[PDB]
Amino acid sequence: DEAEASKFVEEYDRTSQVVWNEYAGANWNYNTNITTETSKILLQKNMQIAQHTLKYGTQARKFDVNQLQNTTIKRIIKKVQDLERAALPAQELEEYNKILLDMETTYSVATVCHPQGSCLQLEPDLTNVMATSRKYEDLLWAWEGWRDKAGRAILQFYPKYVELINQAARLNGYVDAGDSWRSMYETPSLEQDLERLFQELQPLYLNLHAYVRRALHRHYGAQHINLEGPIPAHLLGNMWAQTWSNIYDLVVPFPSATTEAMLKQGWTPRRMFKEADDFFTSLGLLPVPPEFWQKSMLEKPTDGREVVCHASAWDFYNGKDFRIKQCTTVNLEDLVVAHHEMGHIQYFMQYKDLPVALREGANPGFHEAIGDVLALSVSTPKHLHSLNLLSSDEHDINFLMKMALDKIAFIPFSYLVDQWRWRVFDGSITKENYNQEWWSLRLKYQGLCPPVPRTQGDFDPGAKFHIPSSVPYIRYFVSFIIQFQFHEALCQAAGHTGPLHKCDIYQSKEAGQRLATAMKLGFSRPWPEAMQLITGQPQMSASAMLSYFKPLLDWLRTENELHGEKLGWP
Ligand SMILES: *[C@@H]1O[C@H](CO[C@@H]2O[C@@H](C)[C@@H](O)[C@@H](O)[C@@H]2O)[C@@H](O[C@@H]2O[C@H](CO)[C@@H](O[C@@H]3O[C@H](CO[C@H]4O[C@H](CO)[C@@H](O)[C@H](O[C@H]5O[C@H](CO)[C@@H](O)[C@H](O)[C@@H]5O)[C@@H]4O)[C@@H](O)[C@H](O)[C@@H]3O)[C@H](O)[C@H]2NC(C)=O)[C@H](O)[C@H]1NC(C)=O
Ligand SMILES: C[C@H](N[C@@H](CCc1ccccc1)C(=O)O)C(=O)N1Cc2ccccc2C[C@H]1C(=O)O
Numbered sequence: 001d002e003a004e005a006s007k008f009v010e011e012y013d014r015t016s017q018v019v020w021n022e023y024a025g026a027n028w029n030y031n032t033n034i035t036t037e038t039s040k041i042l043l044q045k046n047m048q049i050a051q052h053t054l055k056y057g058t059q060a061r062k063f064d065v066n067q068l069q070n071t072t073i074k075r076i077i078k079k080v081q082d083l084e085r086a087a088l089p090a091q092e093l094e095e096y097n098k099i100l101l102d103m104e105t106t107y108s109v110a111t112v113c114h115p116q117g118s119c120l121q122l123e124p125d126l127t128n129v130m131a132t133s134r135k136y137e138d139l140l141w142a143w144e145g146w147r148d149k150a151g152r153a154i155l156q157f158y159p160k161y162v163e164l165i166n167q168a169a170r171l172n173g174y175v176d177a178g179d180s181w182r183s184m185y186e187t188p189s190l191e192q193d194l195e196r197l198f199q200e201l202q203p204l205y206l207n208l209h210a211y212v213r214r215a216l217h218r219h220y221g222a223q224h225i226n227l228e229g230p231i232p233a234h235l236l237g238n239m240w241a242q243t244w245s246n247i248y249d250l251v252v253p254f255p256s257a258t259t260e261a262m263l264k265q266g267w268t269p270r271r272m273f274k275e276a277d278d279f280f281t282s283l284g285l286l287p288v289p290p291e292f293w294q295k296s297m298l299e300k301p302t303d304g305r306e307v308v309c310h311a312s313a314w315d316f317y318n319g320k321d322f323r324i325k326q327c328t329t330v331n332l333e334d335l336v337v338a339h340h341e342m343g344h345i346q347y348f349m350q351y352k353d354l355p356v357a358l359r360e361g362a363n364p365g366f367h368e369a370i371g372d373v374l375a376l377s378v379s380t381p382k383h384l385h386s387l388n389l390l391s392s393d394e395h396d397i398n399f400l401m402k403m404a405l406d407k408i409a410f411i412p413f414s415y416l417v418d419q420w421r422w423r424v425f426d427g428s429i430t431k432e433n434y435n436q437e438w439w440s441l442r443l444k445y446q447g448l449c450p451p452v453p454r455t456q457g458d459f460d461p462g463a464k465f466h467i468p469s470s471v472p473y474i475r476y477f478v479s480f481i482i483q484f485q486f487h488e489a490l491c492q493a494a495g496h497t498g499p500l501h502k503c504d505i506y507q508s509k510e511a512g513q514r515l516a517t518a519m520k521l522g523f524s525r526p527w528p529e530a531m532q533l534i535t536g537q538p539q540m541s542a543s544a545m546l547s548y549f550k551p552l553l554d555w556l557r558t559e560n561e562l563h564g565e566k567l568g569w570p
């Protein structure tokens, strides 16, 4: 009985590794070569994994986990009881798989065209426009056009998607898909805990917002920026106004105090990933295997192939084959993304000897945080100078501002995406109100407004990758808080004293060992245990992020007071 459960999970593990390896292959092949042939093979392999999931999930529900003694086996069996989409009847499963493929393909191949002119793709063309253009009308063209071509094209699929993902969730014991997603944290108090974290970041965000709004007023003109109102959503350097540091040049605190350098000094996608690999091994963490260099797709193909560019990290479930797929551009932003992705690979490597059911991060935010922690150190002026990419309190404030434009601005954005989705999933937001409710949250949390009134048929959420790709978002909110807790702890372990923002953990084997111990746990233990291993305490806390940015909070409050700024908006 305990012995039958044990046999049970050993069979599940051997067979799952095979079937999931085959599925991952097919998924990779489609993602790196969108065609009717790779699509067919993918939709077929979907049916194979579904059949396996159904078989072993059915058997897992036969056990009473309330009676099982071994806590590992109990946990594994409990997890395998969740069939996900494989719970759906065949007709619905087929329709759901097709909807998901159609959504992700629509997003990844959408283009925005000038008449009798060229057609731009999101990566790299529209990304580049949003980062570098300082002309209202040109930014508006890219911003609106991307929504018109990607967002509006997702709308036809989204209501049925919601029906079917919710139907699957109910068949697995949840009330809706949002309930199921939140369950990944195993934290009954999650919604309140996240809300309290968000509230703690509000002083810093409102101060940053007002400061940036002032700067935008200077460049884009008084007639286009209301100093007591929300900021137009196309002016922040990024398609979603999720991270703002591409407009650093417009907001630099101290003018008198890297892309050109990276290009001129011969950086390439492969060198960028080598740098990241080197950073991991400097901490005594694992190098990526030779296979990774052979099989990864580290730049957009030139050969014609249509691909899913949006960067991702892949585990092929055999303990050996790990890959990144990224349409890498040579710049510092993308170097940060490369490190983000390499953190996923590092996690995959660290937990590769666990049973597959426990091959996940302690929670999804932990998986998102690892690579970002290393990138915090990469980003420091000291470290960028060490890489030759660069040649005082003023310098300090400038650097904190650059960091804040990405890390603090992202907090409200990352919070809001799943506040919207949880309310779609629970039925609170119907299809008639999708776009209005998206904008009411964009206002409430980020203090943004759309530069052109939205119209019938718009579906702006569809223009953000994780929406059509059905990837949960709250993990990134969690990540952006906890990564600073990890940085604080690893900097302490490495013996750093003085301001946390001056910390660089490069070469610290003590920092590496802290992270490795936690990563090796996988999903085997409640996530607070992993939090405590790394930090010495069990909770999510904004204290570390606040500590990092303290000198900037102080500077921004003084600066905003001198200009008589009215924080917030109506
Ligand atoms: C409750 O049961 C758990 C689980 O027990 C194991 O799994 C069940 C299904 C049975 O098959 C049982 O025989 C197994 O032991 C108990 O936890 C285990 O306890 C043992 C003994 O302390 C511990 O042993 C260590 O294993 C470490 C890592 O092992 C893996 O990596 C090896 C080298 O890479 C390799 O030989 C194996 O790797 C494969 O294993 C995965 C699972 O099958 C597979 O998916 C993957 O592809 C891997 O390649 C090996 O499993 C190693 O570092 C140490 O030296 C130890 O020998 C296990 O780590 C531990 N397992 C887990 C998941 O915790 C637990 O003790 C028990 N409780 C009680 C009170 O009885
Ligand atoms: C680049 C990354 N891509 C996802 C891809 C996630 C994925 C999961 C399952 C199937 C396919 C894709 C990731 O690897 O988690 C990303 O989506 N962000 C990281 C990041 C990096 C820098 C700044 C912000 C963010 C958040 C997020 C994003 O860009 O929206």
Ligand SMILES: [Cl-]
Residues within 6 Å of the ligand: 240, 460, 461
């Ligand atoms: Cl939007």
Ligand SMILES: [Cl-]
Residues within 6 Å of the ligand: 181, 184, 364, 365, 472, 473, 474, 475
């Ligand atoms: Cl998540």
Ligand code: NA
Residues within 6 Å of the ligand: 122, 310, 465
């Ligand atoms: Na994208």
Ligand SMILES: [Zn+2]
Residues within 6 Å of the ligand: 340, 341, 344, 367, 368
């Ligand atoms: Zn990630």
